[PDB]
Design a protein around this ligand. Structure first.
Ligand SMILES: [Cl-]
Ligand SMILES: [Cl-]
Ligand SMILES: [Mg+2]
Ligand SMILES: [Mg+2]
Lengths: 198, 198
């Protein structure tokens, strides 16, 4: 609730299970192709790992998340909806969902709004920021599964502290101190927010 | 081209002729209803002025911009595309298009991306920021036709200076010094940018 601590919450990999949705739909569509089990995922870009696996598989992978209903049908991560609803109800706390669309824009922007409406309600649509460059969005915190966030972004010194949210693709990564992780929504996110308050 | 001066350029009323597109489609769809000529427009919210004109006309007005192809078919303002292309090519200048979607999200986000692709090309899609709250986007300048920009926004002290871009609905407004206007894209926008440079 609305100086408020401002928290940017990423969508794919934090609220929505992109990795699991992708794998399931990839195996269904391309049952004769090899795949990458989640525990074996390494690196942020799915299509790059698939492209190394077999020739043509980058393009096949892309075709999964370019398809209609891919984004809309993603399942929420455990605890994500509940945590963000609670976070948004806290005193002196403003929550925005900060998400980057894919390059093919026929479905993805629309479906992200629709997904937010479905899980958070119409009033939360006000809190969505769509951008490929999150460094130009000012906040105290950014909770996001992408390790390299600057990429490179236009703002060399973002205002936010990036808290890395654990995902299959980043779980083994050693971070440079003092970078921090949120391991799951079961982990103590309130303590992370409180550490940034006056 | 990519510390760079960062300029947020609004879409409706700055790049795209929302007011003229709206009026034309309103008169075509509702030929028996009264309308507001552009010179008589007052206040940012179109639907509010229409609602005062006749009962039910707010809802009719809304139905124009909720329709498919409304946003996509908007015409560029004179000089807008050319100016923003030139601006983006300047040394030490990063340009983002910063636009607020309407509440009904079936078409508007998609069509705004499609509009940018059509006039600026695929590579400029990277520069789009969609948000209802522009105060959380950091920059040196925001060129926008809306007079009241904070509304109220979550950031009480935005980083940008708001330069009011003239539109039919704001052309008579007296601003509190030191607020500034860009009267049209024919006006000297380079001088405004240069005033913010080191
Ligand atoms: Cl999923
Ligand atoms: Cl138009
Ligand atoms: Mg993510
Ligand atoms: Mg505008």
């Amino acid at each position: 609730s609305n100086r408020a601590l401002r928290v940017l919450v990423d969508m794919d990999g934090v609220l929505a299970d992109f990795e699991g949705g992708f794998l399931r739909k990839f195996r269904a569509r391309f049952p004769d192709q090899p795949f990458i089990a989640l525990e074996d995922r390494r690196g942020f870009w799915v299509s790059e790992q698939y492209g190394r696996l077999r020739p043509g598989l980058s393009e096949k992978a892309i075709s999964i998340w370019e398809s209609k209903n891919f984004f809309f049908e993603l399942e929420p991560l455990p605890g994500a909806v509940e945590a963000v609803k609670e976070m948004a109800s806290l005193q002196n706390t403003d929550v925005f969902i900060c998400t980057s669309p894919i390059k093919m824009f026929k479905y993805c922007p629309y479906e992200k709004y629709a997904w937010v409406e479905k899980y958070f309600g119409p009033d939360f649509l006000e809190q969505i920021v769509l951008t490929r460059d999150k460094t130009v969005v000012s906040a105290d915190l950014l909770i996001d599964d992408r390790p390299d966030i600057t990429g490179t972004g236009a703002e060399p010194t973002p205002s936010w502290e990036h808290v890395l949210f654990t995902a299959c693709h980043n779980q083994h990564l050693q971070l440079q101190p003092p970078r921090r992780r949120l391991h799951s929504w079961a982990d103590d996110w309130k303590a992370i927010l409180d550490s940034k308050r006056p």
